[PDB]
């Protein structure tokens, strides 16, 4: 498969290099390795492709002069980015295509956040009403950058979880909620919240009322 | 070469057919790909060389066209098909290479399923929020279709700021949404008022949940 790495929070004006790492196949076989980005809530945007056999590269007209694509080994391709702006905030994907046959293989993406400010850890607050069935949850408030991870009962609680998309508030900080529906026969529910950018780890058991 | 998709968004009934258009400003023959992207996931290849289905793609997806004008059709729409669809140029005539490159702008497909009225929950702020200087009240609208609008009133005054809305993607099985609406105020503002109301409206129907800062 494919895995992107290198994303994180950077200031406007920064440079940054991302890496796309291949497993199970080799860039010594003939493929186009490409980078595609997607700003939050916007469309896919092609950046550049490289032909792994000879390193011939092709660039979007907005990228040439500011982004560089490179084959650095038989398992890695990089994307060097310079003079970053807030509008470069996006998920950056690497994808593999052949000749004329689309891109069947994509990585999960790495998030690049170009913003002023500094990392901030989330506060975690329980959500409960002021009943044989009840919805409880955790509010994960005021963090930067994305992502946070939220599981319940360390991922063994299955039925009835709804984790909503994060929202970026006008302050530039994000917030996210996750709720779970339980019956009176249930055991306690614990949300496990992690914010890797700040090495934050919090477990919160939420009780009714 | 410029790639243009229309429309920007389209609503289709379960079981219906919807067609999406992609235009190239100069001919790319058959070298056009289509992708599906569900919120929070990488895109998945649907169609390559304008009409060839990728592996594992159900046959209700079809593509057509060659040159400058292309169509993606979903024949027998399912709730799972709620997604954004993109076309991609796969040929560069300057260089005569076939690498996958520029995208169209994307088309969002909304699926019209059976209507379902929302139930509503309001979550008063946990006690330790207020010492932080701000307070966030959460209102949830569960399992509903079609879309709702949310109104917050504080002591009867409609709020017009401090509000954020987040909607889960349409459910693959029943087309429904879920919605989290937050009202954020300063601790001074929160302590200055008493009644906090979340009003969820679905067409001509309204569900309201409220609490009082003294009763929790």
Residue numbers in the entry:
A (entry chain B): 3 to 35, 35A, 36 to 52, 52A, 53 to 82, 82A, 82B, 83 to 100, ...
B (entry chain A): 2 to 95, 95A, 95B, 95C, 95D, 95E, 95F, 96 to 211
Q: What does the paper behind this entry write?
A:
Neutralizing mAbs 10A, 11A, and 11B isolated from BG505-SOSIP.664-immunized rabbits led to the definition of a highly immunogenic glycan hole (GH) present on the surface of the BG505 Env in the vicinity of S241 (Klasse et al., 2016, Klasse et al., 2018, McCoy et al., 2016). Antibodies specific to this particular epitope were identified as the primary source of neutralization. Negative-stain electron microscopy (nsEM) illustrated that the antibodies approach the Env surface from the membrane-proximal side of the trimer (McCoy et al., 2016). However, given that mAbs 10A and 11A also displayed a comparable loss in neutralizing activity when they were recombinantly expressed as Fabs, we concluded that proteolytic digestion did not have gross detrimental effects. Glycan hole 1 (GH1) class antibodies almost perfectly overlapped 10A, a prototypic GH-specific neutralizing mAb described earlier (McCoy et al., 2016).
The target for HIV bnAbs is the metastable envelope (Env) antigen, which consists of the two glycoproteins gp120 and gp41 arranged in a (gp120)3(gp41)3 trimeric assembly and sits on the surface of the viral particle. Stabilization is required for the generation of a recombinant molecule (SOSIP) that mimics the native trimer on the virus, and these recombinant trimers bind bnAbs and are antigenically native (Binley et al., 2000, Sanders et al., 2002, Sanders et al., 2013).
